[PDB]
């Protein structure tokens, strides 16, 4: 099925944590742990610690999000 309570809000890469991990601060309100989307990692697309990025956030855990749009 796949519910639809997902979101695409944007933000900026803050920290450059380990294993394709980032502090990404949502333009919206705060920042989340944000991990690099599979797609994106498969197509490489390095991601500097200060880029505007798109996030996929499950209301289930706003605290986390996946980076969708590369830059």
């Amino acid at each position: 099925a796949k519910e639809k309570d997902t979101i695409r809000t944007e933000g900026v890469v803050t920290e450059a944590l380990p294993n394709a991990t980032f502090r990404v601060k949502l333009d919206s309100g705060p920042e989340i742990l944000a991990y690099i989307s599979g797609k994106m990692r498969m197509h490489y697309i390095r991601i500097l610690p200060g880029d505007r990025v798109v996030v996929e956030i499950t209301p289930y855990d706003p605290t986390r999000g996946r980076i969708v749009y590369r830059k």
Binding site: A16, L48, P49, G50
Partner: protein, 91 residues
């Protein structure tokens, strides 16, 4: 005269690594050289708001005893930012 020697402070150079080579940078200044800090960001023309001016500023602020800095530059040229550091000037 006063020479130019140099130190660097890259990102990921914090207290550990850092103030060890703040000791190295005293040494430069304390020879009576003008010790030039070079930042070398993982970054850009505006790399940081973090990388540089934690480090640089705390290098000044810790070394402030012996050395002071010419400028707190915060104009990066390239992917790297020189903060220039000198002997503290006798008025």
């Amino acid at each position: 005269v006063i020479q130019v020697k140099e130190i660097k402070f890259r990102p990921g150079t914090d207290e550990g690594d850092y103030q060890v080579k703040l000791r190295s940078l005293i040494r430069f200044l304390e020879e009576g050289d003008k010790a030039k800090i070079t930042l070398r960001f993982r970054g850009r023309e505006m790399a940081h708001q973090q990388i540089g001016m934690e480090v640089l500023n705390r290098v000044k602020d810790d070394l402030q005893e012996l050395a002071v800095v010419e400028s707190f530059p915060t104009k990066i040229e390239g992917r790297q930012m020189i903060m220039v550091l000198a002997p503290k000037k006798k008025q």
